[PDB]
RNA sequence: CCUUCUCAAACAUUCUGUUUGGUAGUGAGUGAUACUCUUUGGAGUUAACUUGAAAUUGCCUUAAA
C-alpha cells in the first residue's frame, strides 16, 4: 500500500535483482514477504493475491511447504531461507 | 414535634413508578438549552442573512410564572418539590390548586425538578397546554395523580404529623 | 426483580418475532412450492445499503457467495423464539457477539429472513478475512495430554497440518484460498476454526465511554432496518471498515 | 467531571458540545526540547519500533482501541514505505 | 367479609396468563388465573379474575397494585365480597370457518331458488309493487 | 345482457317507493346487492377495487353535500420522504381543473403517533367519507387505522400506485388523482355469500346515469366472479329483481 | 416501558401509460333490511351507529454494578 510520490541505494549491498522479480505462493510467510523484494528491485506476486482472482518474468519462487508437487520449468526455485 | 396539617402534606409524595412516568413525559419537554437558542438563531441568522414557525413548547417553570398560570386558570399539572430552602414559598400551592381544581403533584427533590428544566433547582415546574402526541398520556397522567395522590390522601388535610 | 413493565415489554417484542417469522414461513411455503396463486412477489432480494446513505436493491439468484456474519445484539426486547433460536443454534451464535463466515447458496438464502434482525451481514473482503482470522480463532484440540475441555490459540503448525492432514493442508493461509476463493465445501475450514468472538466496538459503563455508547445506539438504531413484512429483503452492508474497528 | 456532570443530569446535546470543545495537547515542544533536532529524534526510536510493530500486531481488545492499532500499522507501512522505498 | 379472589380490569395487549401468573406469583402462588378472551378474532376482553392463596395475599397484591399504572393503562384491581365463584370464560381462540356444502344436487337447491324467487315476487306483490322476473 | 326497462321501472317505481313521506340520508341511498355460491374463501382480505363506471357520483356527492350536515372532504396519505417533496400548495395549482381538492396530506407516522388514541383516531377519520392512501403504505394500514374504519367502504382506504418508475414525480399524482376520481368507484369484496355495493344517492342525476351504472357494473362483475343472483334496493328495501341466473348455479355441483 | 408489512413483478416507451397481484383489526355494545346456508348445525356475509385503548363470569446480559 502507500503510493509514495515526490514534492542511490546501499552502494551496492541492496539494489540487487536488477530488473528482476520473484513470485511467492500463499504458503510463503505472511509477516515477511514483500520486504527486500521491495527493498531490492522487483515484484512480489502472492498466490494469496490471486485469492481475489504477471507470472512472466518470474524465475525464483518460494515455498515453505515440506514438498512442492509439482514444479514449473522456467522458475528457478529457492526456499524462503534463501532470501536471507 | 407535632407539625401542622398544612405541613406534612409534603412528605407525602409520588411513588417510584408514577414519578418515573411523569419524567417519562417531561423529559420530552426539556426547555431548550442556552446553546440551543444560540444554535437555531445562528443558523437562521445566516439564512436570512442570505437565503412557518409552529408555537414552541416546553414546561412553564417560573415560580411567579407558575402561580400566574394558576388562578387564571391555565395549567394542567404542577410539580412541587418537597424541599424549599425557605419552606414558606410553596406552602400555599397545594391549597391553591385545590380550591382551583388544578392537578398539583408533589414530586420529590428540587434537584430532580431542577434537572429537567436546565437549572440547578426549581421546586415548582408545571405545564398547561401540551402537544397532541402525549395529550392522552397527560389526561391519563393527571388521572393517575388524581387516583394515587389525590384520592385517599384527603386525610392529609387534618392530622398534625410528627 | 420482575419490573412488571418489562414483562409485558418482552411479550410484545416476542410477538413481533412470531407473527413475523410465521408469515415468513408461509412465504417460505409459497416460495418452496411455487404454489403461488395470489402472493406479493415470488422473487426475493437483497437490500444493499452503503454510505449520504446510498442504497439499492438486487436479487441473490445464486451462484453461491459467502455472506459475512457479525452478530450484535437486538432488538434488545425479545425472547428468542423457537425457529430463530435453532437456526442460530446451528451457527451457535447465542452467547452473542460471535462473528462467523457463512457461505450462502439458495438453500442458505431463504433461511436468512429469520436471522435478518439479529446479525448484521455483508460480503467481506480479503484483508477482512485474513485480518479477522490473524487476530482471532481457537481450536479444540487433544493430544499427548489433555482430556481437555479447553481451547487452544492458533500457533502450532503441528495441529494446523495435523488436523488438516485429511485435506492435505498445512499453513492455514491455505484455508484462505479455501475461503477467499471458497475451497472445497469450505465447511471443515470454518467448523475447524471454531469461529470467532469479537470485542465489542466500544466498552461500557464509564464516563466518556457512555457517550460513545449513546452514539452507537444512534447509528446502530438507524442503519439496522427491517421490513417485518415476510417479504422483507435482506440487508447488506460493507463490513470491511466495521472490522477495521471491531478487529 | 463536566461530562459526568451534565451527563449526570442529562442533556446529551451539551455532552456532545463538550466532546468537541475539548482538545488534546501538543507534545511537540518536548520533541524539540528533548530530542533536538533531527538526529536526536532518530536516536532511540527503535525502542518505539518494538512497540509500534508489537501493538500494530495486537488483536483489538478494550484498552487497545483499534484506532491505536490503525495508526500504528499505518505508520508501520509509511516507515517501511520510507525504508522499502529508500 | 370479602373474597380471596381479585377482580382485575383494564388489561393491556400482551398481558395474559403467562404474564398474569408470572407477575402475580410474587405475591404468593395463586390458585387461579383467568383472562377473558374473545369468542372470535382472537384477543382479550381487557379484564380477568384471579385468586392467590388466602385473603391476605389478595390484600397485598391488590392494594399494592390497585391504582398502578402501566403503558397506557392504570390497572383497577379490587377484591369481591364473600365467594363470587369464578366459573366460566374458558380459554378461547379464533375458531376457523368450517365449510360443509353443498351436499344436495341442484334439484332442491336450484328449486328453492325457483320457489324462493317465485314466492319472492309474491312478496313484492304484497308490498305491493309490481315487478317481473 | 339484462333488460334496461326492468331496472328502469325498478328505479322509477323505486322513486315511487322513496316518494312517500340523517334518517333521510339513511333512506335515499340506493344500494346494489349481488350474491354468489361463495365469496373468496377462508381469507379476510381488505383489498379494495377501482370500478370503471359511467361517471362518478363523487361530483354529485360533493356539490349536493356542499350544503350537507356531514360535509365530507378529502384525505390522502403520502410516504415518509415524499411529504417534503410534494407540498400542499404544490398540488393545489393542478387539481382545480376537475373542481376537486384534497384537504390534508399526512404520514402514517402521524397516524401512529398523534392520531392513535382510538377516540382521537376514530374521531379523526370518521368525519371523512372518501379516502385515499398509497399502496406501499396500504400494506401497512391494517394495524394503524385499526379495526374500526375498515367497517365502512367509506373510510377504508382506496389504494393507488402513486410512485413512478423509478423515483416518483408528481405528474402521476396530478392526473392519477383524477384517475381515481372521475371514472372509478372503489368497492369491497368480503367473505360469505353476499356483497352489496354501495351505489348512489337518489337525489343525484336522473336515472339515466344510474341505470347505465347498473349495466356496466352488473355485467362487469358478472364476468369474472360467476355470480348467483343480483338485486337492487334503496338501503331499506325488499329486494328488486334484475338478472336471475341459474345457469352458473350448477357450477356448485361442478366441484362438489 | 414495546414500536408497527411504508412494495412487487408484467406489459407498452409515453416528463407518464397499461395490467394482475400484495393489507386479518383493542374491546364493548345500538340495530331496524336482507343474502346464504345446513338440519337445527345457524354458520359465513348485508346499510350505519356510541365510545375517556372505557369493562365483570357469550362452555442475547455492557440497557451492570
3-state SS track over C98-161: EEEEEEECCCCCCCHHHHCCCEEEECCCHHHHHHHHHCCCEEECCCCCCCCCCEEECCCHHHHH
Sign (positive or negative) of CA dihedral F215, F219, F222, F228: positive
Per the structure, the complete domain to which residue B78 belongs is given by 1-162
Q: Find which nucleotide's C1' atom is closest to C200's CA.
A: G62
To which residue does cell 497440518 refer?
C161
Residue A6 to residue B119: CA distance in whole angstroms: 57
Provide CB contacts within 8 A for C20, sequence distance 6+.
C228, C230
Chain D within 8 Å of C211 (Cβ-Cβ)? yes
Residue F132 to residue F120: CA distance in whole angstroms: 19
Question: Domain count of chain C?
Answer: 1
Residue F105 to residue F88: CA distance in whole angstroms: 7
Interface of F with B (CB under 8 A): 113-114, 117, 120
F168 three-state secondary structure:
coil
Count of other CB atoms within 10 angstroms of residue F19: 8
Interface of A with C (CB under 8 A): 26-27, 30, 47-48, 50-53, 64-66
Those nucleotides of strand G lying less than 7 Å from any protein Cβ are 1-9, 12, 14-28, 32-39, 43-65
Is C165 exposed, middle or buried, given 0-12, 13-18 or 19+ CB atoms closer than 10 A?
exposed
Query: For chain C, how far is it from start to end, CA to CA, in angstroms?
Result: 36
DSSP state for residue C65 in the 8-state scheme:
E
Which of F49, F32, F13, F7 is CA-nearest to residue F189? F49
Which of E25, E28, E9 is CA-nearest to residue E17? E25
Count of other CB atoms within 10 angstroms of residue A20: 15
Q: Among B35, B36, B115, whose Cβ lies nearest the Cβ of D10?
A: B115
Are F188 and F174 within 8 A, CB to CB?
Answer: no
* CA/C1' separation E130–G50 (Å): 40
- Bond from prior residue into B73 cis (ω within 30 degrees of 0): yes
* A contacts of C177 (beta carbons < 8 Å): 26, 47-48, 51
Which of C115, C132, C99 is CA-nearest to residue C244? C132
Q: HSE of C10 in the Cβ direction (CA atoms, 13 Å)?
A: 13
Provide CB contacts within 8 A for D78, sequence distance 6+.
A2
F184 three-state secondary structure:
strand
> Does the CB of F45 fall within 7 Å of any strand G atom?
yes
* CA/C1' separation E100–G38 (Å): 8
Cell numbers representing residue F149 in the block: 374504519
C191 three-state secondary structure:
helix
C-alpha separations of F201 from F5, F129, F189 in Å: 20, 14, 21
Chain F within 8 Å of E53 (Cβ-Cβ)? no
* CA/C1' separation E107–G40 (Å): 21
Question: Domain count of chain B?
Answer: 1
Best A46, A48, A66 residue to mutate vs chain C (most C CBs within 10 Å): A48
Which backbone phi and psi does F160 adopt, to 5 degrees? -160, 155
Cell numbers representing residue C207 in the block: 464516563
DSSP string, C217-241: HHHHHHH-----SSSPPEEE---HH
Residue C227 to residue C40: CA distance in whole angstroms: 14
CB pairs under 8 A between C and E: 26
Are F104 and F82 within 8 A, CB to CB?
Answer: no
Checking chain A for breaks where C and the next N are over 2.5 Å apart, the residues before them are 7, 53
Residues β-bridged to residue E79: E6
Are B127 and B161 within 8 A, CB to CB?
Answer: no
Sign (positive or negative) of CA dihedral B72, B73, B75, B81: positive
Which ranges of E1-78 does DSSP label H, i.e. alpha helix?
17-24, 55-65
What's B80's domain CATH number?
Answer: 3.30.1330.30
**Pairing state between β F104-107 and F75-78:** parallel
Are C60 and C44 within 8 A, CB to CB?
Answer: yes
Are C36 and C225 within 8 A, CB to CB?
Answer: no
E65 to chain C, closest Cα gap in Å: 11
Which of B133, B70, B77, B124 is CA-nearest to residue B99? B70
Residue C14 to residue C21: CA distance in whole angstroms: 11
Cβ within 8 Å, pair F16-E129: yes
Which backbone phi and psi does E94 adopt, to 5 degrees? -100, 105
Which of B78, B80, B75, B79 is CA-nearest to residue B128? B75
> Does the CB of F147 fall within 7 Å of any strand G atom?
yes
Cβ burial F46-84 (10 Å sphere, 16+ → b, else e):
eebeebebbebbbbbbbeebeeeeeeeebbbbbbeebbe
Are E52 and E27 within 8 A, CB to CB?
Answer: yes
To which residue does cell 361517471 refer?
F55
* A contacts of D84 (beta carbons < 8 Å): 34-35, 38-39
Chain E within 8 Å of F13 (Cβ-Cβ)? yes
C-alpha separations of C195 from C100, C131, C151 in Å: 6, 14, 12
**Pairing state between β F229-233 and F240-244:** antiparallel
Which backbone phi and psi does A62 adopt, to 5 degrees? -135, 125
Best B136, B138, B140 residue to mutate vs chain F (most F CBs within 10 Å): B136
Angle at F120 between CA F119 and CA F123, to 5 degrees: 75
DSSP string, A18-71: TT----B-SSS-SSSSSHHHHHSS----BTTGGG----SS---EE--SS--SS-
A65 to chain D, closest Cα gap in Å: 24
Residue C47 to residue C233: CA distance in whole angstroms: 6
Residue C126 to residue C115: CA distance in whole angstroms: 24
Provide CB contacts within 8 A for F9, sequence distance 6+.
E131
Residue B105 to residue B90: CA distance in whole angstroms: 12
Cell numbers representing residue B112 in the block: 430532580
Per the structure, the complete domain to which residue C130 belongs is given by 1-247
**This structure's resolution (angstroms)?**
3.7
Which of D4, C109, C54, E106 is CA-nearest to residue F246? E106
Cell numbers representing residue C244 in the block: 477495521
* D contacts of A1 (beta carbons < 8 Å): 77
B142 to chain F, closest Cα gap in Å: 16
Residues 26-55 of E with CB under 7 A from strand G: 36-41, 43-47, 49
> Does the CB of B143 fall within 7 Å of any strand G atom?
yes
Cα-trace Rg, chain A? 14
F95 three-state secondary structure:
helix
Best E72, E100, E113 residue to mutate vs chain F (most F CBs within 10 Å): E113
| Residue length of chain E | 133
Are F99 and F74 within 8 A, CB to CB?
Answer: no
**Pairing state between β E44-51 and E69-70:** unpaired
Count of other CB atoms within 10 angstroms of residue C9: 17
DSSP state for residue F139 in the 8-state scheme:
T
**Pairing state between β A77-78 and A61-62:** parallel
> Does the CB of F113 fall within 7 Å of any strand G atom?
yes
Are C130 and C229 within 8 A, CB to CB?
Answer: no
3-state SS track over C14-75: HHHHHHHHHHHHHHHHHCCCCCCCCCCCCCCCEEEEECCCEEEEECCCCCCEEEEEEECCCC
Which backbone phi and psi does E110 adopt, to 5 degrees? -70, -30
- Bond from prior residue into B162 cis (ω within 30 degrees of 0): no
Residue F107 to residue F120: CA distance in whole angstroms: 16
Are C213 and C202 within 8 A, CB to CB?
Answer: yes
Residue C193 to residue C145: CA distance in whole angstroms: 21
Amino acid at each position: 500500500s502507500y503510493i509514495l510520490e515526490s514534492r542511490k541505494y546501499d552502494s551496492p549491498v541492496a539494489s540487487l535483482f536488477s530488473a528482476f522479480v520473484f513470485y511467492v505462493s500463499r504458503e510463503v510467510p505472511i509477516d515477511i514477504l514483500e520486504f527486500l523484494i521491495l527493498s531490492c528491485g522487483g515484484n512480489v506476486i502472492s498466490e494469496a493475491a490471486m485469492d481475489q482472482i504477471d507470472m512472466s518474468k518470474v524465475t525464483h519462487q518460494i515455498v515453505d511447504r515440506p514438498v512442492l508437487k509439482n514444479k514449473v520449468a522456467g522458475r528457478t526455485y529457492i526456499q524462503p531461507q534463501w532470501i536471507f | 414535634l407535632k407539625v401542622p396539617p398544612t405541613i406534612a402534606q409534603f412528605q407525602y409524595t409520588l411513588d417510584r413508578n408514577t414519578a418515573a412516568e411523569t419524567f417519562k413525559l417531561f423529559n420530552k419537554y426539556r426547555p431548550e438549552t442556552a446553546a440551543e437558542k444560540k444554535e437555531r438563531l445562528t443558523k437562521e441568522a445566516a439564512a436570512v442573512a442570505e437565503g412557518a414557525s409552529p408555537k414552541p413548547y416546553a414546561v412553564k417553570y417560573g415560580l411567579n410564572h407558575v402561580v400566574a398560570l394558576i388562578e387564571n386558570k391555565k395549567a394542567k399539572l404542577v410539580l412541587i418539590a418537597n424541599d424549599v430552602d425557605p419552606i414558606e414559598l410553596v406552602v400555599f400551592l397545594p391549597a391553591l390548586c385545590k380550591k382551583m381544581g388544578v392537578p398539583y403533584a408533589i414530586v420529590k427533590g428540587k434537584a430532580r425538578l431542577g434537572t429537567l428544566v436546565n437549572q440547578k433547582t426549581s421546586a415548582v415546574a408545571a405545564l398547561t397546554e401540551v402537544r397532541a402526541e402525549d395529550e392522552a398520556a397527560l389526561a391519563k397522567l393527571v388521572s393517575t395523580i388524581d387516583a394515587n395522590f389525590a384520592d385517599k390522601y384527603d386525610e392529609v388535610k387534618k392530622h398534625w404529623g410528627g | 426483580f420482575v419490573r412488571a413493565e418489562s414483562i409485558v415489554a418482552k411479550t410484545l417484542a416476542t410477538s413481533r418475532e412470531k407473527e413475523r417469522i410465521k408469515r415468513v414461513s408461509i412465504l417460505e411455503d409459497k416460495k418452496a412450492k411455487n404454489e403461488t396463486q395470489h402472493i406479493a412477489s415470488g422473487k426475493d432480494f437483497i437490500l444493499k445499503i452503503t454510505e449520504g446513505l446510498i442504497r439499492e436493491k438486487t436479487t441473490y439468484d445464486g451462484k453461491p457467495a459467502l455472506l459475512f456474519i457479525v452478530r450484535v445484539r437486538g432488538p434488545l426486547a425479545v425472547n428468542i423464539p423457537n425457529k430463530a433460536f435453532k437456526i442460530l443454534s446451528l451457527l451457535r451464535l447465542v452467547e452473542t457477539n460471535t462473528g462467523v463466515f457463512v457461505k450462502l447458496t439458495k438453500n442458505v438464502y431463504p433461511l436468512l429472513k429469520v436471522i435478518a434482525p439479529y446479525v448484521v451481514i455483508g460480503k467481506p473482503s480479503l484483508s477482512s478475512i485474513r485480518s479477522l482470522i490473524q487476530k482471532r480463532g481457537r481450536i479444540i484440540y487433544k493430544g499427548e495430554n489433555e482430556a481437555e475441555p479447553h481451547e487452544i490459540v492458533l500457533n502450532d503448525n503441528n495441529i494446523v497440518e495435523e488436523q488438516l492432514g485429511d485435506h492435505g493442508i498445512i499453513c492455514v493461509e491455505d484455508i484462505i484460498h479455501e475461503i477467499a476463493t471458497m475451497g472445497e465445501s469450505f465447511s471443515v475450514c470454518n467448523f475447524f476454526l471454531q469461529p470467532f468472538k469479537l470485542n465489542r466496538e466500544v466498552s461500557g459503563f464509564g464516563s466518556l465511554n457512555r457517550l460513545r455508547k449513546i452514539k452507537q445506539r444512534e447509528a446502530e438504531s438507524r442503519t439496522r432496518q427491517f421490513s417485518n413484512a415476510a417479504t422483507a429483503p435482506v440487508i447488506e452492508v460493507d463490513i470491511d471498515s466495521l472490522l477495521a474497528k471491531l478487529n | 467531571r463536566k461530562l459526568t456532570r451534565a451527563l449526570g443530569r442529562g442533556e446529551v446535546s451539551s455532552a456532545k458540545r463538550l466532546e468537541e470543545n475539548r482538545d488534546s495537547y501538543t507534545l511537540d515542544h518536548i520533541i524539540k526540547e528533548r530530542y533536538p533536532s533531527f538526529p536526536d529524534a532518530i536516536r532511540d526510536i527503535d525502542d518505539a519500533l518494538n512497540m509500534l510493530f508489537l501493538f500494530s500486531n495486537l488483536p483489538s481488545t478494550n484498552q487497545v482501541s483499534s484506532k491505536i492499532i490503525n495508526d500504528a500499522q499505518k505508520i508501520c507501512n509509511q516507515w517501511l514505505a520510507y525504508v522499502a522505498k529508500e | 367479609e370479602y373474597s380471596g379472589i381479585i377482580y382485575v380490569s383494564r388489561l393491556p395487549h400482551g398481558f395474559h396468563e403467562k404474564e398474569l401468573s408470572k407477575y402475580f406469583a410474587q405475591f404468593g402462588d395463586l390458585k387461579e388465573v383467568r383472562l377473558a378472551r374473545n369468542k372470535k378474532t382472537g384477543n382479550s376482553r381487557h379484564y380477568g379474575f384471579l385468586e392467590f392463596v388466602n385473603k391476605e395475599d389478595a390484600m397485598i397484591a391488590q392494594e399494592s397494585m390497585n391504582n398502578y399504572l402501566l403503558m397506557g393503562h392504570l390497572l383497577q384491581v379490587r377484591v369481591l365480597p364473600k365467594g363470587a365463584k369464578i366459573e366460566k370464560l374458558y380459554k378461547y381462540k379464533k375458531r376457523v370457518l368450517v365449510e360443509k356444502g353443498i351436499t344436495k344436487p341442484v334439484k332442491q337447491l336450484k328449486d328453492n331458488m325457483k320457489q324462493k324467487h317465485e314466492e319472492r315476487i309474491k312478496k313484492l306483490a304484497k308490498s305491493g309493487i309490481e315487478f317481473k322476473w | 345482457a339484462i333488460p334496461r326497462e326492468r331496472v328502469i321501472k325498478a328505479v322509477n317505481e323505486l322513486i315511487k317507493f322513496t316518494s312517500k313521506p340523517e334518517e333521510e340520508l339513511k333512506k335515499d341511498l340506493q344500494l346494489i346487492v349481488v350474491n354468489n355460491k361463495s365469496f373468496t374463501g377462508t381469507s379476510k382480505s381488505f383489498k379494495l377495487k377501482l370500478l370503471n363506471v359511467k361517471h362518478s357520483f363523487y361530483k354529485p356527492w360533493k356539490e349536493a353535500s356542499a350544503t350537507a350536515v356531514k360535509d365530507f372532504k378529502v384525505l390522502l396519505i403520502l410516504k415518509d420522504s415524499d411529504i417534503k417533496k410534494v407540498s400542499e400548495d404544490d398540488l393545489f395549482d393542478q387539481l382545480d381543473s376537475e373542481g376537486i381538492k384534497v384537504d390534508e396530506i399526512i404520514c402514517g407516522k402521524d397516524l401512529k403517533t398523534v392520531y392513535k388514541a382510538y377516540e382521537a383516531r376514530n374521531a379523526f377519520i370518521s368525519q371523512f367519507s372518501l379516502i385515499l392512501a398509497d399502496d406501499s403504505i396500504v400494506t401497512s394500514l391494517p394495524k394503524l387505522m385499526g379495526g374500526k374504519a375498515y367497517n365502512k367502504v367509506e373510510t377504508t382506504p382506496i389504494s393507488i400506485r402513486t410512485h413512478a418508475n423509478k423515483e416518483f414525480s408528481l405528474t402521476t399524482l396530478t392526473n392519477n388523482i383524477k384517475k381515481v376520481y372521475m371514472n372509478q368507484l372503489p368497492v369491497k369484496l368480503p367473505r360469505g355469500t353476499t356483497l352489496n355495493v354501495h351505489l348512489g344517492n337518489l337525489e343525484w342525476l336522473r336515472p339515466e346515469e344510474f341505470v347505465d351504472n347498473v349495466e356496466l357494473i352488473s355485467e362487469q362483475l358478472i364476468k369474472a366472479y360467476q355470480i348467483r343472483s343480483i338485486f337492487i334496493k334503496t338501503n331499506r328495501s325488499p329486494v328488486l329483481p334484475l338478472y336471475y341466473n341459474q345457469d352458473v348455479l350448477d357450477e356448485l355441483e361442478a366441484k362438489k
